[PDB]
Design a protein around this ligand. Structure first.
Ligand code: FQ0
Ligand code: FQ0
Lengths: 221, 211
């Protein structure tokens, strides 16, 4: 990417979840149409990827779009779907183990991303990058209720390949999960960046990691 | 002008508030008390939240009491938080509420005293729903189903609009994963025993400012 001066951390999360929210508000603030902000959301994700590789984060899960999101106008659906496709394809030009998780039994799931629905090594690998594409919390839990029993259910949710989230970072100033991986996020420390996702700065992630290293982790204990 | 600051008028209210009354052990340690001594100082704060919610007309409040995960803690701490949870429900039972306790009753950790409240119980004039999670667990809740999603253990408890957590941590600690998927979360840095009405007022200001 480009040269940064990255702070030293005493403790790092194994698995970060990213909610790249605020693209529509960012676009409206600059006098663009709501849907135009998604096309300015790709380079921020590449900056997150570059920082995580440099500091040695093992796994990053990006919130792409949910089944709930596909209720929005067509022009928005096309914009966020196009940006999700480009994002996965950009990580595919780099060093990663890519996994896409979402409901592939839908016309809404992009054909371009089917190849990534089993973990796929690109370049040298050595960081796990997950994308939630046509994901839904309800679809995720009900996958287990249908296809499992009892103790087995939890192990058989749709997102079962994605492990517990240590740190969840959300851009766009809202403090809410928007149904991201309810099972993996029961204990996650949540950090909210007030700036919209397209206004990403390395300091956003540095401040989130400073927050994480200051937390007492009990995982329900 | 009066003893207490007046309860503000809010332009938007949540239908359902979740409360995580965290920080009791850190509060106790900071005062030079033993870890388990914080819990008994967390009961009056709950009654203050109850009183304020009745005054503004909040429809439903769910209090995080203790989880199955929490019963991994030392016996002296388990007895302290269990005793304080029992007292809390009994104090609401002397007032005006529709009380529901949700939790795994199939345990010698679940207090016999609260079995009568595992079906929704109208006390006094009712007019507010008060829920307590007692020996609750997210894993127990989701697996209880064994349509299935609508038959989770906590099915009677609706979507949480606003979740307020004391003790400065921004995390759910497995509180109602299904009901909290879209919840707005407000964190109070002060430990729960240091509850002030302004904590709840600022949380409600936060909620009414959301889009
Ligand atoms: C690693 C890389 C390269 C990109 C990762 C970030 C990403 C998926 C950017 C695509 C833009 C996008 C649809 C963000 C999703 O925002 C959601 C919440 O607000 C839905 O509207
Ligand atoms: C409505 C009323 C009156 C009281 C409700 C609050 C209550 C049950 C107090 C009881 C003691 C207490 C605070 C327990 C909470 O501790 C948990 C959080 O950290 C442990 O996991």
């Amino acid at each position: 990417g480009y040269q940064m001066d990255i702070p030293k951390f005493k403790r790092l999360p194994r698995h970060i979840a990213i909610i790249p929210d605020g693209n529509r508000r960012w676009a409206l603030a600059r006098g663009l149409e709501k849907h135009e902000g998604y096309s300015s959301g790709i380079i921020p994700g590449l900056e997150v990827y570059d920082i995580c590789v440099k500091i040695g984060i093992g796994e990053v899960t990006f919130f792409g779009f949910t089944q709930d999101n596909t209720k929005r106008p067509q022009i928005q659906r096309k914009a966020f779907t196009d940006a999700c496709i480009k994002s996965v394809q950009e990580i595919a030009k780099r060093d990663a183990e890519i996994l896409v998780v979402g409901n592939t039994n839908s016309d809404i799931f992009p054909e371009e991303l089917l190849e990534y629905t089993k973990r796929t090594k690109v370049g040298k690998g050595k960081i796990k990058i997950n994308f939630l594409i046509n994901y839904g919390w309800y679809w995720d839990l009900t996958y287990a209720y249908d296809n499992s029993d009892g103790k087995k259910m939890i192990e058989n949710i749709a997102s079962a390949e994605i492990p517990r989230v240590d740190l969840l970072i959300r851009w766009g100033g809202r403090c809410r999960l928007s149904g991201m991986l309810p099972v993996q996020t029961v204990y996650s420390d949540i950090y909210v960046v007030d700036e919209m996702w397209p206004d990403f700065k390395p300091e956003h992630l540095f401040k989130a990691l400073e927050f994480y290293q200051n937390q007492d982790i009990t995982l329900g204990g």
